[PDB]
Design a protein around this nucleic acid. Structure first.
Lengths: 88, 128, 70, 74, 135
RNA sequence: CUUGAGUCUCGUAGAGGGGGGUAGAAUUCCAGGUGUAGCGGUGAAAUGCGUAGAGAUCUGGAGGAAUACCGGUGGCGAAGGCGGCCCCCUGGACGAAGACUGACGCUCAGGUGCGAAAGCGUGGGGAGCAAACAGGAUUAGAUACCCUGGUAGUCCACGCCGUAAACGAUGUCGACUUGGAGGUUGUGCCCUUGAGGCGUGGCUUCCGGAGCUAACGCGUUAAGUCGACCGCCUGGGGAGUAC
């Protein structure tokens, strides 16, 4: 679930120029926005365990699709990690 | 307890009407007549009928308790009574019946047997 | 315990059968026993178990005839 | 003839009265005794959706005093 | 936006307070691009059991849509309102803003069975009969 | 590539989590009024409470756990797990069209994260019940049995090793296998004529045919037909302890 206005910003900037939501680069970016919002919540609410299950899903898929993207084009990968400003 | 008394004529306040509260327990019934504005005008009990023990806690012992409370308030000058009932205990009908034999009208037979929103945890009792 | 459901025409005897439909159950029925939080789902909720008895009671009349036991 | 859609006695043998609305007192009293409490959903032959949703809509209605909360209130 | 169906009642003697209060709460809903989709006044009605004492209260079904952010501030203000005795707001899922189950009983109230008295003139001043102070 | 999985906007159903708000009621308690003799407990009973005026009742207040009947074989989570009602934050699941990427997959030593319950450190909170502790009652004698008084505990917040009966009395997930119907839900259609039917999905479950079991039992969600990978067993007692 994401706000409408973010979902279109993500579509303009990420995936292909067809403006899709299915490609590896834009799905990484869609997970990231949901992770990013949640780590802001997860400064407190430290006993909120059924929602954390979800945190761990969104992180686990993000790792996998970035691993996939390095198995695929090295151009697409090197751009993506730098355009989406990921990790620390 | 009650006595085998000669015929009654005595005055207190000539009130004509009252409300009653019948408080039913697991061992007993407590029957208490009050004024309509809320002030105790007299009581009886089923252990005070001297059945004692479990034997105090039956439809017949409850009866004799209601007829008891109903007797003393004739000196209060009551002529009609109405009732509230509050409990699961015995004297289900036989107590309202006793009040009615005292020559009273009893048109409003109000169940108020209280449902707390899951109140205080009970003694566990037997292992079933 | 006259039961709150009102009797047709008021009288000194409460008509305790004709009033009850769903009273005591669950609130004041497990009286003087130790109270649990989530237990009722498995202690009390026995509706499935009781529908099979309602089906067997209505089935057997017809089958007692059909086997020729009647 | 086609598309008559809920004339009378049609969909269910016991009619669904409300779903999740609680502001009319009379739909709610359709399943509420003179003791001031709900009849079981096995007895009524009510459809489960409306009943499951009624468990929220009746607690709501008691809390807005459209209904008696309690036996004491006669 | 998401839909929150609020209904509330107000203590009779204190009903003169709500006609000022309502016009800020509606500006906080339309100022955020929400809508008030009916605003039905029910007249004075008899409570079954008292709420904050007294056996009477004056009924309003407002019927809101507003974004989730704004209704959270506005509900905490209504609950700590001294004029409001209680309110209940129902879930968004599968929620109606048309075709009122009480549509005939609302019209009946207003027409023929109301108070016709000054504390229920105020209730309609917070009702469909809105009279409101300038901002 | 799609045949695996994943993802966007719409709709839907539920007690999933985490934080906020909120009403009325018995016990109980405080204040004032009224009022007399038992009250309480059980198999029956005594301890316990009361004439120094108890018990109960009216009016007002106090206080905290809790919130049903609705609540169903339901539904949600990962096994255990979740129930007043409402809002904020947020997970996970079910349907449907337009549409997309295209094995990005399975399992998992290590691992980080996380509790039914009580245990547990301090703060907040205490109404009721109760291990202990006193005493009664019971009697091969009575710590068990049974009762009365009654504390920590139960309740909230963070924090510490996540304990057991962690389950369809299935390790996981996945692929394949006559179905019908229930419980109950998206949605096209019905005289919208059983919690109903058909069309097309859904979990969840009863029934029974193939196969499987020592027997119960399972049966299309397997405990069938098999598939991969991990965890783990090798007689009892002593020991789920020791090390």
């Amino acid at each position: 679930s994401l706000s409408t206005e973010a979902t279109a910003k993500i579509v303009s900037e990420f995936g292909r120029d067809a403006n899709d939501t299915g490609s590896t680069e834009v799905q990484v970016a869609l997970l990231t926005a949901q992770i990013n919002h949640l780590q802001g919540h997860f400064a407190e609410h430290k006993k909120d365990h059924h929602s954390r299950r979800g945190l761990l899903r969104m992180v686990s898929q993000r790792r996998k699709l970035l691993d996939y993207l390095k198995r695929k084009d090295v151009a697409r990968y090197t751009r993506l990690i730098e355009r989406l400003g990921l990790r620390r | 307890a009650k006595a085998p008394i000669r015929a009654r004529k005595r005055v207190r306040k000539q009130v004509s009407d009252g409300v009653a509260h019948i408080h039913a327990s697991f061992n007993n019934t407590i029957v208490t007549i009050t004024d309509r504005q809320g002030n105790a005008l007299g009581w009886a009990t089923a252990g005070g009928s001297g059945f004692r023990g479990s034997r105090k806690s039956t439809p017949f012992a409850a009866q004799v308790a209601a007829e008891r409370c109903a007797d003393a308030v004739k000196e209060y000058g009551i002529k009609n009574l109405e009732v509230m009932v509050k409990g699961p205990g015995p004297g289900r009908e036989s107590t309202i019946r006793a009040l009615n034999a005292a020559g009273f009208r009893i048109t409003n037979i109000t169940d108020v047997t209280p449902i707390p929103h899951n109140g205080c945890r009970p003694p566990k009792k037997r292992r079933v | 315990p006259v039961i709150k459901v009102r009797e047709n025409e008021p009288f000194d005897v409460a008509l305790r059968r004709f009033k009850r439909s769903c009273e005591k159950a669950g609130v004041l029925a497990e009286v003087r026993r130790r109270e649990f939080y989530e237990k009722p789902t498995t202690e009390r909720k026995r509706a499935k178990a009781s529908a099979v008895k309602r089906h067997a009671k209505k089935l057997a009349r017809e089958n007692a005839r059909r086997t020729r036991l009647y | 003839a086609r598309y008559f859609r809920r004339r009378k006695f049609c969909r269910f043998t016991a009619e669904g009265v409300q779903e999740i609305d609680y502001k009319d007192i009379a739909t709610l009293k359709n399943y509420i005794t003179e003791s001031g409490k709900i009849v079981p959903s096995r007895i009524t032959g009510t459809r489960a959706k409306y009943q499951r949703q009624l468990a929220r809509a009746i607690k709501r209605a008691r809390y807005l005093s459209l209904l008696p909360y309690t036996d004491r209130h006669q | 936006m998401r839909h929150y169906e609020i209904v509330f009642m107000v203590h009779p003697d204190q009903s003169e307070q709500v006609p000022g209060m309502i016009e800020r709460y509606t500006a906080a809903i339309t100022g955020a691009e929400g809508k008030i989709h009916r605003l039905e006044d029910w007249g004075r009605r008899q409570l079954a059991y008292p709420i904050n004492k007294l056996h009477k209260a004056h009924y309003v079904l407002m019927n809101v849509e507003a974004p989730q952010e704004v209704i959270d501030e506005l509900e905490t203000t209504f609950r700590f309102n001294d004029a409001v005795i209680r309110s209940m707001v129902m879930r968004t899922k599968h929620a109606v803003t048309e075709a009122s189950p009480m549509v005939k009983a609302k019209d009946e109230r207003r027409e023929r069975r109301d108070d016709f008295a000054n504390e229920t003139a105020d209730d309609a001043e917070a009702g469909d009969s809105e009279e409101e102070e300038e901002e």
